[PDB]
Ligand SMILES: [Cl-]
């Protein structure tokens with residue numbers, strides 16, 4: 001009785017399942033761009049509060065957003081408010097906290113897990129943990145927590161055991177997200193891949209070829225969704241990855257975006 005007629009997909013480029021060379025140019029108005037922030041567009045710093053955002057970063061993101069007609073999103077482990085504090089690009093789509101909060105292109109923000117009483121109990125146990133271990137840093141991120149040990153590398157084992165134990169106590173609601181010198185505890189059932197897939201179901205992203213660039217383990221789920229949709233996944237820096245392309249550094253990734261912009265306008 002009812003049918004499912006599609007319009008020819010606006011994507012004009014498809015990447016196969018193989019390693020790929022980063023293209024010289026992309027049809028910016030038929031491409032969707034998803035970027036991690038720390039370690040991807042900006043260098044990783046000794047602590048989250050110590051990152052340095054060069055002026056090139058907001059200029060390049062905003063030019064890509066103009067030339068692509070809005071199909072640019074940040075998909076970060078930071079909160080949306082933090083991303084806003086560093087880029088100050090009004091109305092930029094942002095998935096923050098690994099997908100635990102998301103602002104769409106209309107400017108509507110959805111959050112899960114904020115004010116959850118279990119997170120406050122987890123936070124209290126981690127606060128006692130970092131009290132006993134100088135050099136560890138507990139970062140409280142709204143609905144998520146980050147247990148840092150970059151300045152206490154000898155405490156990676158105790159950080160892992162504590163975070164794994166607390167997550168297991170609430171395994172129905174929370175999940176562990178390891179990263180570079182950090183263990184993050186975040187609501188279950190949201191991730192960077194799901195956030196990308198949600199963007200790709202909405203204008204202006206829907207139907208476009210997706211690009212996802214990232215540097216850490218959380219970003220592998222973004223690479224997975226970009227690859228499943230025939231797009232271009234870019235790992236920044238060293239490490240095993242499912243990304244189809246790789247660049248050496250934040251500066252080298254920045255240089256790729258700059259070339260795509262120049263080739264566009
Ligand atoms: Cl993720």
Ligand SMILES: [Mg+2]
Pocket residue numbers: 036037038039040214215216
């Ligand atoms: Mg990162």
